[PDB]
Write a protein that binds this ligand. Sequence first.
Ligand SMILES: NC(=[NH2+])NCCC[C@H](N)C(=O)O
Ligand SMILES: NC(=[NH2+])NCCC[C@H](N)C(=O)O
Lengths: 283, 301
Amino acid sequence: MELHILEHRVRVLSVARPGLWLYTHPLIKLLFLPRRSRCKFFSLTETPEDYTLMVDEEGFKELPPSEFLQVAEATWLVLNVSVQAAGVTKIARSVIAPLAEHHVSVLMLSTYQTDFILVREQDLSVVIHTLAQEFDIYREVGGEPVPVTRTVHPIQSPQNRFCVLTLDPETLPAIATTLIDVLFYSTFFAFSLIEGYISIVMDAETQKKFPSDLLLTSSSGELWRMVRIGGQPLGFDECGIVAQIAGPLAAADISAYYISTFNFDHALVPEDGIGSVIEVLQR
Amino acid sequence: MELHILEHRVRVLSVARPGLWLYTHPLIKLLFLPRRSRCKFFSLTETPEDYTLMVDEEGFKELPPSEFLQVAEATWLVLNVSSHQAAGVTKIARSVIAPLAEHHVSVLMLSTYQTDFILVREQDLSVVIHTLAQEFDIYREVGGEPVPVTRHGPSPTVHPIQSPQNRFCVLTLDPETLPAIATTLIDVLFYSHSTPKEAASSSPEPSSITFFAFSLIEGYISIVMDAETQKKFPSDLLLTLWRMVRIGGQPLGFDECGIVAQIAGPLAAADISAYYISTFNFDHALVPEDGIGSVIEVLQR
Ligand SMILES: NC(=[NH2+])NCCC[C@H](N)C(=O)O
Ligand SMILES: NC(=[NH2+])NCCC[C@H](N)C(=O)O
């Protein structure tokens, strides 16, 4: 029905782990102090390779250049589609496969609340032409929608069990010192704060570290297994990577959250279905 | 009547305000993550010019060198007199401050909500003991328990003073409350606009000065903050005004003696309470707000 080009203009960055200390001051601001910046799109993911940041242009300005900070080419726009499978599965045929077929490279950010599909600004007219025959397409300007006018990659699954959680923004101060400890002083951990909504992906072991009654989910105890996608770093030009994972999962009707980082892709699937997901993906 | 030499070996440092972002990672650790360091003595004072740190040797290892980090030469020991007239350093002006200055022992002061600490350089300890053993029964803290003790600067001058008009409160907190106020404390300390540099010569009575003192010493929390800044926190968490006299024109260094004495002496004769906090560059006496006029008059004599 409806595809929205959100008001965000996003840069994609990698912070090398030995340099994270240098970015503590701006990241604490972007995580916890909304009155100190105009950033409305913030996503931070920790991997064994780096910290990946996706931030809008205003949040980007808070990050000083250094030898520890890599910035992917291009400014990325954020797409969002308006009972269904969780995560990317419900947009695999309608968004992911058509963009791959038309050679538009994407970055995925599934969150607790919704699925963001990032595309480079240069591809906007192809995105519109490709998706207009299923969606009425709108651009968000001033908070309101305006109608638009004129290779097989290796996979692996570590044993970690993951939680997909949200948080009432009014309680973010109450978890701040634990979140700080986990991110800066302590492997996959994702935190995003986008248009005021918080989404967190966290190891079941890491969840034990937080105060008991603050992290929220509509499915208590629902755990996910991660499928890491890619052997060498994936870059930002190769298309069809999400599609070769999300396509088979949609055909099997298996829910999957999907998160791109700077170097790799990650699908989160129901923990009890990890065997059937691996089988499906090896076909 | 008792004087206690505490179990802290302290380094005194300054992070120049423009370099603060480089030190946010260690400072956040020392403020909020006790399981991450063996530090038992941590004092952070924000001024318009810098963040002064007094930190024990374990906390000191968290702070790597840079152009924005100044470290005072000496390793400092910490003295305390429990005595329960005017309060604060005024109570020890004649018994501790003046004798140490007369015997050329340079001090640093750190008043907290809980008590008044006097820091001295470790190489002066023998002179300190010999000077104060007549009036005080001296004990040294070993493993948390008191054990009886039985065994280059400019010449002193009268320093200029400055009397900012804002009002300060002295507060403590339940340590279990520290996590709940962390984001506000972080915002106040590290993300807030500050007053521009103002010398005493051109600004004898500034309307306001940026000044926030936080200490965590053996688990006890002490905070000195502008009264206006209390409103940013919740009222049931802050456990409970004062005017500041800032002392110095040029940075005071660590070797001139008799600076505290020239303030605490007259205040004792006027029976005026005074909290006293040394930072890397200047000294700060906090006096009851309704007495500031008398205080300025006595100091200007
Ligand atoms: N850095 C990355 N995670 N790259 C892979 C992202 C997905 C890929 N660009 C696609 O269109 O299918
Ligand atoms: N950096 C400073 N605040 N120096 C002044 C401290 C007091 C001075 N050493 C005295 O013995 O009286």
